[PDB]
Curated annotation (Swiss-Prot):
Its EC number is 3.1.11.1. The record marks 11, 59, 106, 117, 121, 135, 154, 204, 247, 274, 290, 350, 353 as: Interaction with single-stranded DNA. The record marks 141, 197, 297, 324 as: Important for interaction with ssb. One of its GO terms (molecular function) is 3'-5'-RNA exonuclease activity. Changing residue 434 to A: No effect on ssb-binding and on ssb-dependent nuclease activity. Binds 2 Mg(2+) ions per monomer. This is Exodeoxyribonuclease I. Inhibited by 10 mM EDTA. It catalyses: Exonucleolytic cleavage in the 3'- to 5'-direction to yield nucleoside 5'-phosphates. Gene3D superfamilies: 1.10.287.1240, Exonuclease ExoI, domain 2, Exonuclease ExoI, domain 3, Ribonuclease H-like superfamily/Ribonuclease H. It comes from Escherichia coli (strain K12). Pfam families: Exonuc_X-T_C, RNase_T. Residues 192-340 form the ExoI SH3-like domain.
Length: 459
């Protein structure tokens, strides 16, 4: 039986790799979004070589102390998430999960020896993200839904309130999951046909049928990169598959001005594209077919819709004709992408993939009891594993370190908690206490954050 697994993370910071998760919540439903089973909610204990971003703690109201008292170590934390995510025929989804939550999942799995990718495709599993579904709905078929404005806001809280959906205790994983389910139900109800279209075209194979590179056939694309002033929508034309990533296609925004593509050379274009802020400026962008982007046949954007959004159909077709009569453009664009770090092992998930041999060895690591990890006599090819293993043991199984390893771990913490870092931390807390002296609830959270810094980082 196929099902949907709505989930959400509340973290101690903004970086998917460098910050740590605080709380996780997941809810399994059926094809109609009716809850099956019970809600899953648990916390993650923070390791002793990390301090939370104060701003994040003020948002969630979750202190390191609460998380430490209620949660499990990250290895156990990951174990549970991996179980929920590996149930067959599951569509793992959330709200803005493709751009944030999934990166957290990949890093948690990475740090704790689980495959960072398999969960999203094996056993007929797949993934989706309601954020872009809301944007496509607003841009193409607005009717039946109230949209917070002075431009369209797609923050979950705003959408729920604007549509009479009870969303109290926001920024609590559990509550956000319930609100996402509510939003999904709302859209499926008020815009059934668009909903199903987006759903059935989320997978790589159905997306592929829409992309016609040789002909440069136009498509409707919804991306936050286009900007709320255009409804995050435009007409794009695929120019070529990426030279080094066959899961990426180079698209040209037909609504922009293409002269830059005609006048400048590939070196210049590359400089401007590789350093610019991602906001549509060279009218070119990449679409990763494995990240469920919103793509639809051109006619989905009716003349009425174009006018409402401000998209000049004719202008787009004019550029389309030009691109077709100027083969040299396909050359320059592909040439641009024909050319593509940290010393912290936590930030090297994307340094490369692990060979089948290392995956096998890492699998044995997962079955080995912590006490025996040191005694384990396994070969590792990838240089990252050795470092990952040491952090894994020191962070989740401290009592397992020998005397010398404890000294090394102590040295490690000293190198993280440098004088400038502690001063910056105190400066921020000082600034926040001055700003929220009144709010008895916020001051309590700030007091806790300073106490926590005292015990984990002082002396
Ligand atoms: Mg989220």
């Amino acid at each position: 039986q196929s099902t949907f697994l709505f989930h959400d993370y509340e973290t101690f910071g903004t970086h998917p790799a460098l910050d740590r998760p605080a709380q996780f919540a997941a809810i399994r439903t059926d094809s109609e979004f009716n809850v099956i089973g019970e809600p899953e909610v648990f916390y993650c204990k923070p390791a002793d070589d990390y301090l939370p971003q104060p701003g994040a703690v003020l948002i969630t109201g979750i202190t390191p102390q609460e998380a430490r008292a209620k949660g499990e170590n990250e290895a156990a934390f990951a174990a549970r998430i991996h179980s929920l995510f590996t149930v067959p025929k599951t569509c793992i989804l959330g709200y803005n999960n493709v751009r944030f939550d999934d990166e957290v999942t990949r890093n948690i799995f990475y740090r704790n020896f689980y495959d960072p990718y398999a969960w999203s495709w094996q056993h007929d599993n797949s993934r989706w993200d309601l954020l872009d579904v809301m944007r496509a709905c607003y841009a193409l078929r607005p009717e039946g839904i109230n949209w917070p404005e002075g431009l369209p806001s797609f923050r979950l809280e705003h959408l729920t309130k604007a549509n009479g959906i009870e969303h109290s205790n926001a920024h609590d994983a559990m509550a956000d999951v319930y609100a996402t389910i509510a939003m999904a139900k709302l859209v499926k109800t008020r815009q059934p046909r668009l909903f199903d279209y987006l759903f059935t075209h989320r997978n790589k194979h159905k997306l592929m049928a829409l992309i016609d590179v040789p002909q440069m056939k136009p498509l409707v694309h919804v991306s936050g990169m286009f900007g709320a002033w255009r409804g995050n929508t435009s007409w794009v034309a695929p120019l070529a598959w990426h030279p080094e990533n066959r899961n990426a296609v180079i698209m040209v925004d037909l609504a922009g001005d293409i002269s830059p593509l005609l006048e400048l050379d590939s070196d210049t274009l590359r400089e401007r594209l590789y350093t610019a802020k991602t906001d549509l400026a060279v009218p070119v962008k990449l679409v990763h077919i494995n990240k469920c982007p919103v793509l639809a046949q051109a006619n989905t954007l009716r003349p009425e819709d174009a006018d409402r959004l401000g998209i000049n159909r004719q202008h787009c077709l004019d550029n389309l004709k030009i691109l077709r009569e100027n083969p040299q453009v396909r050359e320059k664009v592909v040439a641009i992408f024909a050319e593509a770090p940290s010393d912290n092992v936590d930030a090297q998930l994307y340094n490369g993939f692990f060979s089948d041999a290392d995956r096998a060895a890492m699998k044995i690591v997962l079955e080995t009891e912590p006490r025996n990890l040191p005694a384990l006599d396994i070969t590792f090819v990838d240089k990252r594993i050795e470092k990952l293993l040491f952090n894994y043991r020191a962070r989740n199984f401290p009592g397992t370190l020998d005397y010398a390893e404890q000294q090394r771990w102590l040295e490690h913490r000293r190198q993280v908690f440098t004088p400038e870092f502690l001063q910056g931390y105190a400066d921020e807390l000082q600034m926040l206490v001055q700003q929220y002296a009144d709010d008895k609830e916020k001051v309590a959270l700030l007091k806790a954050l300073w106490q926590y810094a005292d015990e984990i980082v002082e002396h």
